[PDB]
Each structure stands twice: as C-alpha cells, then as structure tokens.
Amino acid sequence: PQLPDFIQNKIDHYIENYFDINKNGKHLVLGKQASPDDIILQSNDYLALANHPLIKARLAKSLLEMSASFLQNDYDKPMIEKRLAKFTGFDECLLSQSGWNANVGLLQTICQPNTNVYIDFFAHMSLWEGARYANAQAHPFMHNNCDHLRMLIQRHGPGIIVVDSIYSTLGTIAPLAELVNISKEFGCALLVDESHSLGTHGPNGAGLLAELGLTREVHFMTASLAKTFAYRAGAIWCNNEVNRCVPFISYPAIFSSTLLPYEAAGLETTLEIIESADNRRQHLDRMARKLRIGLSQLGLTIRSESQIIGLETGDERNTEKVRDYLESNGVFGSVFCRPATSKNKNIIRLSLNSDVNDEQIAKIIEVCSDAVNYGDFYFR
C-alpha cells in the first residue's frame, strides 16, 4: 500500500536532505567499516567490561533456571536496588528499563504542567523531553553558566534544576558545587544525571557527587546503566520518598515491561567488578588527559575534562570531510549531528575506554595533527 502524500512527502524530503546529500548516500552518522586494526572510540563501556568473564557467567547462570508496578512489594524488589543506593550514598534507588526512561519517569513524577525546569543547554535530550512530556516550563541556561542560571531562576521562580554531571557530547563537567549552592539559595530541587561519571569517577567509582562530597545536598540522581555498567537499563536514586511513587506515575514504568530478575543479578556482579576497578579508572583518566593535552596544543577547541572528547567540526559538509579523514586513518569516533546538536555545530565524539594504549593515544593525536595540516576541512 503506497503511502499517502502527507507521509510520503515528508519521508522523501527527509531522505533527500539527510541521506542523499552525503557522499555515501547514507546518514552522516554512518561511515566506513572499521578493521580489527583501526582504533574504535564509540562505545560507552568506559571500563571495558562488556566481555567480562565473570559478568557473562553471572548472567548465563541466572538466566539458566510483565510490568514493573505489580512488583513494588517489599518481597518483589531486587537486592540490586539496595546495593546501588548504598553504593551511591543516596537513600533509595529504583530500576528502570533505561537511562532515557529513568529521566522521563522521574520528571513526569515530580513535575506538573508549568513547573519551572532549569536545564543546561547541553543536558541529555531525555531530560528535555522529560520536562516536555510533563508540559513543564523549560528554562534553558547557557552551558555551565551559573550567572545565566541565577537570572532565569530569579526571573521565573523556584523549580527543578537539571544537569548532566559529565556532558555527553563535550565531556565538560557541571559546576556541581555551585549548583548545589544555587538550589539552596533559591529553594530549588537539583536533578543530576551521572550517566558519564558513575563507575569512572568517585570512590570505588561511586560518581562525582560522591567525589565532590555533595551527595547529601542533592535531591535526585539518575543514570543510564548502558555506559560503565555496560547494561541496557536505567536507575533513579532519591534522597527522599519520590521513589515510592514513580512506579505508579511514570508512563514508561506503568505501561512498559520491567527488567527480569536475572538482569538484576547480572548488575550485582558488575557493581562488584566496578567497585574494584581503581586500576582501570586511573589508567583511563591518564589517557584522557594525555589525549586532551595533545589535541589542545594542536589548536582544536577541546572543552572536555573527562574521557569523552569532542572534536568540534562545524557544519554537516565539513563534518563529513573530517569524519572521512579520521576513518581513512584508522580513527573511529561517533558523529553527533542534529537533532543532538544544531546543524552548524556538529561534534565528532571520541569515547575513551580503559583498554586504550598510550600508543593508540599518540596515534590519535598524530592523525589529528596531520588532519590539521592536510587542508580539506577545519576544526573549531
């Protein structure tokens, strides 16, 4: 059944302006195929746990042998939640199907149809849509800009301040200490997404709030477990009662099925293995810094302060050229383009993980050095 025009028209225009314009007839995010020799910097599995023998074993053993609301009794709630909460220092933790759902769910629970939400420009898209589904009043503030933040709160009233601890496209770090002060001052709740800091930062990997000593000041913490925990799930920690209600309020929690008990048993192993990876955290940290210093001396804006490094490659055409160069030279990042970015501010993201060599770090810098000189594109 051929499509009606109202759909077909849209689909053609999309196909035209998003696939056809690229030199390979594909979406900008899709490039070449990588070799076993090439350097891949795409995964969010920062501590390189995706193959971990123990973790796999725990899962197989547990799988050998509906909705989440009907499982909110004391006897129905998994040990993994008590361990994560303890781990993080927060009072309660609630499992979700994903980081995305965790954000969406928390926000729908705690928000009302005009609630002030003060969200960093670069906060994960799920926080945005979170506030949007709840029909909250979104108040964007310039990246990590507390002055802008103050203005807007002063202007619009108390509400919920929303940030990534470590930003997904840029590797920047939120001014958590100052944001904690700001929410105290203006009687606001603070929601922090530690997707990119949890496991990689803090004491035993417990995260940045843990590292900065700010856990006790923060109302809410969320995270995807599809980064360091290398698992398709989410979690919401509360220093309050909200978690008793989220399972009955959040749509994703109500009308969408939950993880099974073996999935939750697999996380417990991951947690242990994470707590002890002081080795991998330190090495990764070393590597990120090495890479960060090396790209900066080249002239590239490198805002990152973490294991996520953003090569700012301007507009789509330029971004394609940059990507092709990087890939032809054995370096594979991930293109971030609209709607994650704006059309004219794409990023090629380099995700570092604990498996990366000093040798591989020197190659990335080198390849970028030569890129800088080549002259087929520019960097911002």
Residue numbers 317-346 binding a second copy by CB under 8 A: 334, 339-340
- The answer to the question of residue 190 lying near a second copy (CB under 8 A) is yes
CB of residue 73 to a second copy, shortest distance in Å:
6
Binding-site size for a second copy (CB under 8 A) equals 87
- The answer to the question of residue 113 lying near a second copy (CB under 8 A) is no
CB of residue 27 to a second copy, shortest distance in Å:
5
- The answer to the question of residue 261 lying near a second copy (CB under 8 A) is no
Which residue in the set 79, 125, 151, 362 belongs to the binding site for a second copy (CB under 8 A)? 125
User: In the sheet that 160-164 helps form, which strands lie side by side, from edge to edge?
Assistant: 92-96, 234-238, 220-224, 189-193, 160-164, 116-120, 137-141
Contact between residue 80 and residue 265 where contact means Cβ atoms under 8 Å apart: yes
Among 68-76, 275-283, 319-327, 360-368, which window interacts with a second copy (CB under 8 A)? 68-76
Among 155-163, 170-178, 321-329, 356-364, which window interacts with a second copy (CB under 8 A)? 155-163
CA quadruple 96, 101, 102, 106: dihedral sign: negative
Q: Which is nearer to a second copy, 7 or 373 (CB)?
A: 7
Enumerate residues 24-43 that contact a second copy by CB under 8 A. 26-27, 29-30, 33, 42-43
Among 145-153, 252-260, 293-301, 309-317, which window interacts with a second copy (CB under 8 A)? 252-260
- The answer to the question of residue 101 lying near a second copy (CB under 8 A) is yes
- The answer to the question of residue 255 lying near a second copy (CB under 8 A) is yes
Helix, strand, coil percent values for the chain (each to nearest 5): 45, 15, 40
- The answer to the question of residue 21 lying near a second copy (CB under 8 A) is no
- The answer to the question of residue 137 lying near a second copy (CB under 8 A) is no
Using DSSP bridges, classify how beta strands 137-141 and 331-332 pair: parallel, antiparallel or unpaired: unpaired
CA distance 69 to 103: 17
CA quadruple 64, 70, 74, 75: dihedral sign: negative
Which residue in the set 219, 292, 321, 323 belongs to the binding site for a second copy (CB under 8 A)? 219
CB of residue 19 to a second copy, shortest distance in Å:
8
Among 213-221, 318-326, 356-364, 371-379, which window interacts with a second copy (CB under 8 A)? 213-221
276-285 LR contacts (CB < 8 Å, sep 24+): 276/204, 277/47, 277/199, 277/205, 277/354, 278/204, 280/47, 280/48, 280/354, 281/47, 281/200, 281/201, 281/205, 281/354, 283/354, 284/46, 284/47, 284/200, 284/352, 284/353, 284/354, 284/356
- The answer to the question of residue 75 lying near a second copy (CB under 8 A) is yes
Residue 198: which of 219, 229, 176 has the closest Cα?
Answer: 229
Angle between helices 53-63 and 261-275 (to 10 degrees): 160
E-strand stretches of the chain: 39-40, 92-96, 116-120, 137-141, 160-164, 189-193, 220-224, 234-238, 308-312, 331-332, 334-336, 347-351
- The answer to the question of residue 252 lying near a second copy (CB under 8 A) is yes
Among 171-179, 247-255, 308-316, 372-380, which window interacts with a second copy (CB under 8 A)? 247-255
CB of residue 170 to a second copy, shortest distance in Å:
16
Q: Which is nearer to a second copy, 126 or 304 (CB)?
A: 126
Among 171-179, 226-234, 278-286, 321-329, which window interacts with a second copy (CB under 8 A)? 226-234
